[PDB]
């Protein structure tokens, strides 16, 4: 549902949730109406998709 997130570069984690000390690997993802392919996003998105 939702949490106080504690998000890093290569991963994202959280605190004060319905469980604590569980963290998620970072990734990238298309959204509704796409618009991930928008070149001004896609440039930034393809960069954020990596720790480059």
């Amino acid at each position: 549902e939702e949490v106080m997130t504690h998000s890093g570069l290569w991963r994202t984690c959280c605190l004060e949730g319905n469980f604590k000390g569980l963290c998620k690997q970072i990734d990238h993802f298309p959204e509704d109406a796409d618009y991930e392919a928008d070149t001004a996003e896609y440039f930034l998105r393809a960069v954020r998709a990596s720790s480059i």
Binding site: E31, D32, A33, Y35, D38, A40, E41, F43, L44
Partner: protein
Amino acid sequence: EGNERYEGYCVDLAAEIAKHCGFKYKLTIVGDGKYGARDADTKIWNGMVGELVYGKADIAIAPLTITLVREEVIDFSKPFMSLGISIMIKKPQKSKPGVFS
């Protein structure tokens, strides 16, 4: 029961039509849940146009569009609301301003 189960523009307009013409009215739901067309093979009119052709109801008060192939078999009043066919899509996000804004 009666008519108060239903609320909407056509319910208001049905109440106005009744108040002018003096008759009482009973709102009823088309049994097949369609506006109405005539079959390719059996030529049966379905929908509310079916209901009207088969004498199910003296009058129809719904978003039923005045169309020529319906004027062949039933009569329509003057338009009470106008319109046109149009396009519905899911809107995109409001775009973030360009990097070179």
